[PDB]
């Protein structure tokens, strides 16, 4: 089999001419030539079967990505694995090759207002579809927004995604969270498990702020730093917003803080389009019940040159896991991954 760095990358015969892109905790990514479609693609080698958590994340993401079909959500083109469960040690996922991501773009490039508007429209268009299926992404951030050389944008990395569950969203103060710190909504640190759609709208707001300035708006170094950043811009919550927080430890922590007044957005972003700032204000609302929903955001005047609800599809049915993937042994998960990937076998 073809080899890359130390490692076997056995994807022949359809895929040849491999080049290293990167590695991570989650596997190795290469580009390759697709001899069938005569284009270069991206392939990720995943080796998850020894670890129950890695199996869960892998199965969840495959199921979601195979079910969704939308221009602004990355798709799975092909999945390569051994013909038998006994011989399957790795899985290779094939996706369209996307040249860059919004994280890399922001590090290196000034965005025009026209690009900011188009990027935001595409994010919200994709998010409308995701939310319409009753799924929450939960880890929206610039590195999970892939771009090609014509600025087509695709949302990726659904490893932390969950079905919405408003009724079970409550929890106590300082509950652990897994998603990326700077893009976590305030309520995560206070009283929320992140099981409602409002947590994704917050993240989009953060992304919009970062596009306007090229830097993260709330770059907290740990928990109460993440909050004290937020409150230094938004100002101290009103009595009405605190009355929403029934848990005493969370409410009394917020009452213990010195008063902060709101910093107006136009002082932070003097070059920004006023319509962009109005929409930003509505996404970065402290109280999640007052936060704008995705459809209202698409209908906002900032996006009027793109808004077309007839070209902003919704899912044909809500999404549900046929099982709870938390309590299954890794051997059962291996079998399920085998079964889900069978449709790509010759
Ligand atoms: N699509 C793409 N182009 N350059 N980078 N990049 N994203 C990384 C990537 C490439 C190929 C396959 C990938 O698979 C991610 C994945 C991992 C587990 C389950 C389902 C999907 C990821």
From Swiss-Prot:
Q: Which domain of life is it from?
A: Eukaryota
Q: Which UniProt keywords apply?
A: Acetylation, Apoptosis, ATP-binding, Cell cycle, Cell junction, Cytoplasm, Cytoskeleton, Kinase, Membrane, Nucleotide-binding, Nucleus, Phosphoprotein, Serine/threonine-protein kinase, Transferase, Ubl conjugation
What's the short name of a Pfam family annotated to this entry?
Answer: Pkinase
Per the entry, which co-factors are needed?
Mg(2+)
For the modification Phosphoserine, the affected residues are 19, 236, 238, 274
> In which residues does the motif TXY occur?
175-177
Span of the secretion signal? none
In the record, Phosphotyrosine modifications are located at 177
The record's annotation in InterPro entries points to: Kinase-like_dom_sf (IPR011009), MAP_kinase (IPR050117), MAP_kinase_CS (IPR003527), MAPK_ERK1/2 (IPR008349), Prot_kinase_dom (IPR000719), Protein_kinase_ATP_BS (IPR017441), Ser/Thr_kinase_AS (IPR008271)
UniProt modified residues of type Phosphothreonine: 175, 180
Q: Which CDD domains match?
A: STKc_ERK1_2_like
Tell me the domain comment: The TXY motif contains the threonine and tyrosine residues whose phosphorylation activates the MAP kinases.
**In its UniProt entry, what is this protein called?**
Mitogen-activated protein kinase 1
Species source reads Rattus norvegicus
């Amino acid at each position: 089999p073809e080899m890359v760095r130390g490692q076997v990358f056995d994807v022949g015969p359809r895929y040849t001419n491999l080049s290293y892109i990167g590695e991570g905790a989650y596997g190795m990514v290469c580009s390759a030539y697709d001899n069938l479609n005569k284009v270069r693609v991206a392939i990720k080698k995943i080796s998850p079967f020894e670890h129950q958590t890695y199996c869960q994340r892998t199965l969840r993401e495959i199921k979601i990505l195979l079910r969704f079909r939308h221009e602004n959500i990355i798709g799975i083109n092909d999945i390569i694995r051994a013909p038998t469960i006994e011989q399957m040690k790795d899985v290779y996922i094939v996706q369209d090759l996307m040249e860059t991501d919004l994280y890399k773009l922001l590090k290196t490039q000034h965005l025009s207002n026209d690009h900011i508007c188009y990027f935001l429209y595409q994010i919200l268009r994709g998010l409308k579809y995701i939310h319409s299926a009753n799924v929450l992404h939960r880890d929206l951030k610039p590195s999970n927004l892939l771009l090609n050389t014509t600025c087509d944008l695709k949302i990726c990395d659904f490893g932390l995604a969950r079905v919405a569950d408003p009724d079970h969203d409550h929890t106590g103060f300082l509950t652990e969270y897994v998603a990326t710190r700077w893009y976590r909504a305030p309520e995560i640190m206070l009283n929320s498990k992140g099981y409602t759609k409002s947590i994704d709208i917050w993240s989009v707001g953060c992304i919009l702020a970062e596009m306007l300035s090229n830097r993260p708006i709330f770059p907290g170094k740990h928990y109460l730093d993440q909050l004290n950043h937020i409150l230094g811009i938004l100002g101290s919550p009103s009595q009405e917003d605190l009355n929403c927080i029934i848990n005493l430890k969370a409410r009394n922590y917020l009452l213990s803080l010195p008063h902060k007044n709101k910093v107006p957005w136009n002082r932070l972003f003097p070059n920004a389009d006023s319509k962009a700032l109005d929409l930003l204000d509505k996404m970065l609302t402290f109280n999640p019940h007052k936060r704008i929903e995705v459809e209202q955001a698409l209908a906002h005047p900032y996006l009027e040159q793109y808004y077309d609800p007839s070209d902003e599809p919704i899912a044909e049915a809500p999404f549900k896991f046929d099982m709870e993937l938390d309590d299954l042994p890794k051997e059962k998960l291996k079998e399920l991954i085998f079964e889900e990937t069978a449709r790509f076998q010759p």
